[PDB]
């Protein structure tokens, strides 16, 4: 029973412009069907109408993938990812219906980005900025059956370094971010903490 599916730091505010950080790719275990994801994004907490996010997943069989998403509208897999790579992730919201997502593997020199525009079926409020480790869901075709994927164990800790959030061009500190942890079977399965411009999340 997954009681909390997000672990990480969430800032609440207004006019969030860009959210970016560099995260390391961990090794994962627990089975080919166990997984986890690390991503940076805008909205999706107190703003339930949309979320601009980009990041990567790890599966217990040692495989990975990268993606971007403007929920609920455009969602898709982006670059090659290997254990130990350093991935710079970033989203920018130029308006409630326009922005971009960029994922750069600083280790391989590969980079992908997607520009979004005229996003109708779901606009941003630009009131939440976040750095998250998540136990995501797997749904069938018609949303009639959605379930959380078994959460993979990972090592070392996934650290979002050089975190940067801006609101109206002004940079915002992580000082007052709310902290959440992934919780399964009434047990914390992450220990995410903030320190300076770093959000560090250890698997528990």
């Amino acid at each position: 029973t997954v009681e909390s599916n997000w672990g990480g730091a969430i800032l609440i505010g207004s006019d969030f412009d860009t959210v970016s950080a560099t995260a390391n790719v961990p090794s994962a275990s627990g089975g080919s069907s166990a997984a986890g994801t690390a991503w940076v994004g805008i909205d999706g907490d107190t703003c339930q109408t949309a979320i601009l996010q980009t990041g990567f997943d790890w599966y217990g069989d040692g495989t990975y993938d990268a993606w971007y998403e403007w929920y609920p509208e455009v969602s898709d897999d982006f670059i090659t990812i290997s254990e130990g790579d350093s991935i710079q992730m970033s989203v920018t919201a130029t308006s409630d219906t326009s922005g971009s997502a960029t994922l750069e593997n600083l280790t391989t020199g590969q980079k992908v980005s997607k520009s979004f525009s005229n996003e109708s079926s779901g606009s941003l409020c630009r009131t939440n900025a976040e750095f998250i480790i998540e136990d995501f869901e797997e749904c069938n075709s018609n949303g009639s059956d959605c379930e959380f994927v078994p959460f993979a164990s990972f090592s070392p800790a996934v650290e979002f370094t050089d975190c940067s959030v801006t609101s109206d061009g002004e940079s915002v500190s992580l000082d007052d971010a709310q902290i959440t942890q992934v919780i399964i079977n009434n047990q914390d399965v992450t220990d995410c903490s903030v320190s300076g411009t770093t959000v560090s999340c250890s698997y528990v």
Partner: peptide, 7 residues
């Protein structure tokens, strides 16, 4: 499909 989802 993968529902990477609201908090």
């Amino acid at each position: 499909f993968k529902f990477x989802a609201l908090r």
